[PDB]
């Protein structure tokens, strides 16, 4: 260290050896933190907060685990961010990507120990990634022209995605919820159209998908409690002191009777507006804002059910379900469309009452009721159903699939090994390492079930080398089996994203040779 000080007090610098040591330690620690939750027989983690009022949760999601821990190592933040954006993009694949990145870094440390320049490793990995992505692309199977095959593929994808999460206790049941719900969207990717309602009590197998719609709102006093053959007007307008006549006007008179007269005129304005609303021929009114108690009795006298305070999401979901439009100004009854439903009533679930719409016209939005015996169970169930719906929507958008259970990783590794056997120099030693990373995802899975991972991986490699391109792990017994027969199916987009993101994150981290830290901002104690 030079005698002259270039830095302030508290600033820090680490150079090549220490920089690489710190980065590799952080990356490997992050990978091994979440290795344990991979595959059909992974376990869950308990997270409790020291600061956030002792909040408690039980989770298996990789992104949820990584977004909550307080990492301070700079090399771990890159992995956390990559996992987060993977979750934001496809919604599945959060654990495989970070495990693969950690394995790549673990191989790179030994490669550096063998006196190989980082740039050589980077070039070898780039070529290996190109070959692996080509081999994956050539293996895709594209259905979608035939309805029954596509629906069977959707069921297989949902079952594969739900196998590692708690819902696997009732894997068939919840599968029927995951497919049908998505098929209600009629090709729209709006996942906000599916509302998930979770409420305590009852068992996990009592959950269902409603054939109509459910609102957790209330109707006004002295209005009908149920209507048959309803006609629905959906509005977004002010009804509590509607006369925000936005000008800066004021009342300046010389007598109290004039104030009384102006008050009466104010009431007549609301009466006229309510009459104009009723001119449409409705018997149900839904508003997103509050409704004062004078229009409440005006609606009650006319035998019209009124719903108040149904926020933007509720208004849009009802517009999708029934088919009306969100109207205002009520001057042209002919140009506005009304929603229709066969019955509206009130149902009682647990300890609460909800408004139930049955016999709806379109049905392009749905609601799901989750039941369970604990808050953590309900939260994890929602967290898993979200992944299932996300992957199903991705598959519907782009319908080409691959095989899971270690088939795809073995295919990629075989292609990379064949490429590496053809090239001269040190780069070959890099590419082989790449393959040894891809064959670690299957091994880990077997390691979570207590099987002899080495023998199974050797058999799988031997089978893939001779042309059996559909071999994979059969985990209900722990053998080698056909993935097409057993129905282990995944989407192409998720695997491609996992591969590309892991490769780019490893390349980004591997190029760092010097870490510089500024003086931390001191928390003001007193």
């Amino acid at each position: 260290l030079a005698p002259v000080n270039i830095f302030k007090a508290g600033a820090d610098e680490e150079r090549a050896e220490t920089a690489r040591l710190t980065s590799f330690i952080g990356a490997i620690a992050i990978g091994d933190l979440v290795k344990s939750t991979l595959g059909p027989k992974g376990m869950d983690k308990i997270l409790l907060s020291s600061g956030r009022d002792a909040s408690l949760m039980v989770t298996n999601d990789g992104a949820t685990i990584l977004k909550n821990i307080g990492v301070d190592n700079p090399a771990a933040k890159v992995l956390v961010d990559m996992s987060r954006v993977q979750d934001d993009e496809v919604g599945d694949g959060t654990t495989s990507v970070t495990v693969l990145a950690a394995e790549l870094l673990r191989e790179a440390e030994s490669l550096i120990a063998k006196k190989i320049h980082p740039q050589t490793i980077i070039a070898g990995w780039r070529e290996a990634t190109k070959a692996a992505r080509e081999a994956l692309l050539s293996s895709a199977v594209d259905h979608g022209s035939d309805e029954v095959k596509f629906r069977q593929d959707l069921m297989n994808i949902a079952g594969t995605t739900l196998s590692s999460k708690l819902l696997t206790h009732h894997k068939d049941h919840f599968t029927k919820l995951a497919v049908e719900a998505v098929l209600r969207l009629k090709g729209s990717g709006n996942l906000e159209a599916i509302h998930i309602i979770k409420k305590l009590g009852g068992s996990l197998a009592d959950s269902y998908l409603d054939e109509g719609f459910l609102l957790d709102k209330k109707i006004g006093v002295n209005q009908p409690k149920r209507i048959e053959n309803a006609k629905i007007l959906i509005a977004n307008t002010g009804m509590d002191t509607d006369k925000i006549k936005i000008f800066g006007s004021r009342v300046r008179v010389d007598s109290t009777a004039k104030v009384a007269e102006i008050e009466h005129a104010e009431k007549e304005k609301m009466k006229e507006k309510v009459e104009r609303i009723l001119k449409h021929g409705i018997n149900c009114f839904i508003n997103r804002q509050l409704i004062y108690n004078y229009p409440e009795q005006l609606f009650g006298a006319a035998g019209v059910m009124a719903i108040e305070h149904a926020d933007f999401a509720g208004v849009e979901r009802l517009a999708l379900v029934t088919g009306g439009e969100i109207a205002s100004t009520f001057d042209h009854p002919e140009l506005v469309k009304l929603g229709s439903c066969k019955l509206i009533e009130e149902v009682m679930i647990g300890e609460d009452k909800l408004i139930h719409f049955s016999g709806v016209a379109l049905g392009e939005a749905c609601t799901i009721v989750l039941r369970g015996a604990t808050q953590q169970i309900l939260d994890e169930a929602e967290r898993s159903l979200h992944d299932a719906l996300c992957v199903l929507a991705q598959t519907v958008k782009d319908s080409r699939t691959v095989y899971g259970g270690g088939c795809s990783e073995m295919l990629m590794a075989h292609a990379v090994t064949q490429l590496a056997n053809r090239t001269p120099g040190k780069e070959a030693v890099a590419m082989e390492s790449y393959a040894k990373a891809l064959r670690m995802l299957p091994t880990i899975i077997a390691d979570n079930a207590g099987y002899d991972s080495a023998d199974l991986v050797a058999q799988l490699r031997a089978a893939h080398s001779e042309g059996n391109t559909t071999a994979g792990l059969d985990m209900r017994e722990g053998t080698i089996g056909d993935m097409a027969i057993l129905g282990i199916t995944e989407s192409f987009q998720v695997k491609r994203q996992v591969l590309l993101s892991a490769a780019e994150a490893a390349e980004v981290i591997l190029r760092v040779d010097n870490i510089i830290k500024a003086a931390p901002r001191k928390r003001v104690p007193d």
């Binding site: 983690k45 409790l48 821990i69 307080g70 068992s203 015996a373 953590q376 169970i377």
Partner: protein, 77 residues
């Protein structure tokens, strides 16, 4: 056993007699705290709904199955 302990009865003998009487016919035997022994329970007019027992068993089993899935504890912010 708990019901036998809280009433000052001998738990081992009481549970053995309960099992012996349930294994040879009648299935309404129970602990009588008024008599201090084991007798038919409907003669004492103590009954309860079925939903209570069914819900209790189902919720308890589900919670145990959920607990058995955990293998780690992590401290967060």
């Amino acid at each position: 056993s708990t019901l036998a302990e809280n009433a000052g009865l001998n738990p081992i003998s009481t549970v053995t007699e309960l099992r012996n009487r349930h294994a040879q016919g009648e299935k309404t035997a129970g602990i009588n705290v008024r008599k201090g022994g084991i007798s038919n329970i409907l003669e004492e007019l103590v009954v309860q709904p079925l939903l209570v027992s069914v819900s209790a068993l189902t919720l308890a089993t589900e919670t145990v199955r959920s607990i058995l899935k955990i293998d780690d504890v992590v401290n967060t912010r």
